Design a protein around this ligand. Structure first.
Ligand code: FE
Ligand code: FE
Ligand code: FE
Ligand code: FE
Lengths: 331, 414, 331, 414, 75, 75
């Protein structure tokens, strides 16, 4: 029972937990204080990163100049992985640009950062999950989807209202339960357990016609800051919608390997495929999109196409951040 | 951050930047020194190639027996891509047969080559505002376009600048003057010239026009895109999805009047060959005279379109004298794989810092895009990231700036 | 009434009539003593060249160390175009490696060269024509085909007999008349007026299956030293058979221009096409095959494909030699 | 006369000979200096490329921090194609990880690199006749094959030379010895080795063979063509028209066991990738590990064959460490566009000149191929043209020479 | 009898008095060339040495007198 | 948990006592690398800095004592 964590990419604020502030272009072993408890989720802000283990503990590293990590206001940066002070054991975690949001075992939602150095409870009206990106957060319970934060693009409600401090009702189904919420910079895509898009607010990237996508079944929706990506298991490919200025658009070339996992960072994608060519089956992890900081591998030119960053015997879990890539392995 | 520059065609003076002098019939990667650079625009002469970068630098390669590139008279040829010395950061660049003309950020027009081994300033009467200054050049003529007005100099044997005939004009004269609509660009041939406004209309043409091209008949049309070879004019008709060609066409320069299956998204011309870009991902074709490989492996100059490359993102292409340039991820434009502006943010979503008098906005790398209050008063809307090469556009008016001057407690220069 | 002659290629013995002994890679104006009489045929040896005008005159230039041109044994090389002494006005001419064969107005066949400095009549048993290449000559009259010279490959008869001084009966049809004889180094291809191959002796280059080619109609047969080329007007292409070590094999790519003329030298081809793209129609002349000496144009690397050497308003007549190319224009 | 050498793949130390150090995913023309040269064979190391020409010269580019190319210790890297100094005209060349081994016309084996900045002779016991001397090398082992016998040196940690294990063997030892049939070639991997005779039979194998490869089962087969990657063996089965692969294949090195539509005419391997050549004109494919572009634009190492080029004439390909070389018109071989032997002429058709003691034959350029009587007594049959680059083979026996010695009035050394 | 790429006035040709030759830029980077001595004999076609193309030089015999004088040579 | 390209014996690795690092040639031209300090802590995987690939170094703890001594350093 052990989860190894490998990280690479942007590291200017030591948000990779490697101890140093140098950008990496190959997977580096990121060892916390424990490294014995298994990893549940790795949420990433702009310059900070938090790691939620399955024991309710939450460690973090990176920038703290906006209070996204520790309550010590004189603590500007957390050098290595450090325990994040929480009012109660954490069940789920999410990060905004300079904020951190947790959901504890008591069902309470807490938010720190964005100038606020103290964990402040967000009062939101059975499984409870939290999702966040940029300047927005969302809490999902059953069929109801509550969200707060920015609203300059009508990602929460009507009309354009700069910001909402109090959690509002973003969307209700209100029959089939909501599985997750894939959110970008100023937009949002709500998906049910069936696998179909049920709602989408904010400004969606070009080409993404909402009414046409709501008729499709069994989709896995991923979101970068300025693009939406749809994992189509049936066709074994990823459909991308957006400007694609820096190769964020997934290569429409034939994928011979079976896709078994897809994740996205701020402006890059992480693909996990099944390599079955040997006597033993393994897993290839690819990266596509903007990778100047090495978050896509040694080739940092953001050229179109997949880039192989690693190959593992066990199926890895991957997480994306702001020009950072996290690969989690099971020993 | 790196532009993928492909080059092929005539390489007699190493103007392809490949180190060797062998003619290429398939797109070769041309890498400016080490790790390359972000390439904004490529201009081409008879035997020299000029490559403008995103930060206003000029890198060049090719012949130098006329002083097109380096000031060293002893240097007859530039082996590989070498920095072309400039008096100021370059905004725009054009080339002639053996000349290189630039336009700097200060708004001055400099010209080297043609015997002169030093950048001599060309004195064209211009204004001092955000009317940007564009330069265009071909053969023995250059043209400067600020807005509405078009100034030019060089040869005048065919009356392409004024009347009557003159062997040369050293000092720039007013070629043509609108009107109402600002001049978009000037398509130039060997001894002729075609002026187009932003409405896609042919406002004026001078010099020896190729046969079959009646100026009065074409001036009535609009939404046209005009391209020019040395001895032929090519009108991109997006509406009917075809290119109309005018000239002898003794070497297949006349565009194939066959119904294309793909929509045309880009047309450029070299000296005597054309480069077509279509959709489907993105196909690049070549037609016309190509016995130097500038049209692909088939160098027989047969009629039709040769596929020379297919790309995921829309490339911008440049034509030279029997040469063809294909650039991926330029600086900048718009579209897939363009590596252009990351996003356009409105000033109301921007984070204003009174103490620093600058606007910041979160960058996906972890840093922040930034733009100064003073620079925006001067008409700048581009915010750059001090870490990575990502840029954003700030959407604002001069009226919007007044609010932030009042918040910072500073009187604006109004 | 005037024929301009343009030449280029191998010129080591001044066989281009340009006066100098420098190899040319672009068409050079070759002006004889007359240049007013129209050219009927230009025959080429290894290092000598002769030009037959329609007035019965025959001029020549090049090597004479084997007596292929002038009877003056002390004359080793003919600097510029010079009248070739003939016993009678010439109707047809042909050249071997170091030999010259003419057919006069009296119907007599004369041969000079190959060590013999005097024109010596060849006694051969109505139109009379002569064809020659390398170490063999052929005289065609009606249906009968007579030939002499080398026989080491059974190009004349059976068995292998080193050489035949006396003209023998190579082949009789003997119904339909014989149009011409396309001959290579050590082989031969006989064609009738119908346009079909009727006979082929000597060692034919690989791939050329004789029995299969004799069933085809309307073919124009060309021969290099070690390859056979078939002009197919119907398909508008040239079928090549041989090793093709130096691009002698005609490019099987689609020819958009109508082929209006084909000629071959020792190891290279000359194609004439009709360029109809302008308001005025003109003619493109291409070259393919081995062209180190510039006989194919400025590109002397013998790379595969056609090479444009010129473009003319009137349909040119082309002739091939030993790494030399002759383009004849009408003023 | 010029060979068209295409190169792509790993280019970290400029080993592609393109001047830059950017990895290429499409075949780039590599031009040795000016006007290039006729390329016979290309050998590849870890970070250096060696190119043997038709006249016995070595031209190289790449790393030099181990002395693989130049003797100058100060020179850490060779920028472009530069002449590699040789003690004598080179007949054959091979490369190791950081080593270059040649075989000269005198029959001596020289080795540089691996610390040594000078060509030191390797003393392998050979004979003095027309049993030609071939050299083969990979990783840390080299092998010299004259005929029947196979000598080698280098690493011995996996017992690929003899028994038992040794960290290194500086002096060459007899690896394996036939028998009857002469050894055709030796396919070499990282720590293993496969020896094949002219009958296409695996006569001997040593070292750590990849998994699934039973030596005793394969020795029973014949007419096989053996290729080797670092960690895999590949058998070209022309009869069933397929390549049989043996190894882990964790990066698609295992050849696609799908029925090919075209007949296989050529198979070569790099360090961990394969290059397939098929007919139809001539298509070149790549499979295996290619995340450096050595397999084409797709660098995901997915299973299958990537088309990287199509050619009119059959090219010969060479594999390196994450690099791929394609040569058109080499020196020499056989086939279309090979620029090989022009023709083979029998001595009875040859023109003998007693006064000059040489045989001549008409060349299509106007000159004459020529070969000396003395050289033919020593076993030479190639007649060359003193003007152009055309060559012919003279078909004769030592018995045939007696006639011409009697005609010239000269006693032969018999 | 030549098919020409363009017709050029003699005033537009670049004259080189050193070697009595007229030149003009060619779309391939090279230059069409034609000798003064040839033009006096009636020659009107300039040739590029690296390409197929040809141009016609438009001139009269009396237009040559100026360039002969510039080279310091009489016809 | 890593998928490795090959298994290498420690005797086959190139040791650099200057910076206490083990290297081994990589099919891309570069070298798999692994630090002695890491190997003493149980690390067994060498990594190439320019490529995806990884190898396993086969060694026991007592095999490290020789290389520590060669570098002049104690664990
Ligand atoms: Fe940034
Ligand atoms: Fe020759
Ligand atoms: Fe030209
Ligand atoms: Fe590597």
């Amino acid at each position: 029972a052990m989860s190894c964590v490998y990280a690479f990419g942007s590291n200017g604020q030591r948000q990779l937990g490697l101890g140093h502030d140098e950008d990496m272009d190959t997977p580096q072993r990121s060892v916390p204080g424990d490294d014995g408890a298994i990893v549940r989720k790795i949420a990433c802000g702009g310059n900070h990163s938090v790691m939620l283990t399955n024991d309710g503990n939450l460690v973090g590293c990176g920038d703290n100049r906006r209070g996204e990590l520790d309550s010590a206001q004189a603590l500007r940066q957390v050098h290595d992985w450090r325990p994040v002070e929480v009012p109660a054991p954490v069940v789920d975690v999410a990060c905004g640009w300079d904020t951190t949001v947790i959901v504890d075992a008591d069902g309470r939602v807490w938010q720190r950062g964005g100038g606020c150095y103290e964990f402040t409870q967000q009062h939101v009206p059975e499984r409870i999950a939290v999702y966040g990106c940029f300047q927005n957060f969302v809490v999902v319970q059953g069929t109801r989807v509550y969200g707060w934060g920015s609203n300059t693009k009508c990602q929460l409600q009507e009309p354009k209202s700069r910001s909402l401090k109090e959690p509002v009702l973003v969307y209700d189904t209100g029959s089939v339960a909501v599985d997750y919420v894939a959110m970008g910079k100023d937009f949002m895509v709500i998906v049910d357990e069936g696998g179909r898009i049920v709602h989408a607010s904010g400004r969606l990237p070009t080409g993404f016609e909402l009414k046409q996508q709501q008729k499709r079944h069994n989709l896995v929706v991923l979101c970068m800051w300025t693009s939406i990506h749809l994992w189509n298991a049936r066709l074994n490919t990823v459909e991308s919608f957006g400007r694609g200025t820096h190769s964020q658009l997934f290569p429409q070339e034939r994928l011979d390997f079976p896709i078994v996992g897809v994740a996205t960072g701020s402006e890059h994608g992480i693909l996990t495929t099944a390599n079955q060519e040997g006597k033993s089956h393994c897993y290839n992890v690819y990266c596509w999109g903007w990778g100047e900081h090495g978050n896509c591998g040694p080739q940092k030119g953001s050229q179109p196409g997949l880039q192989l960053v690693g190959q593992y015997s066990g199926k890895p879990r991957v997480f994306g951040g702001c020009a950072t890539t996290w690969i989690v392995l099971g020993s």
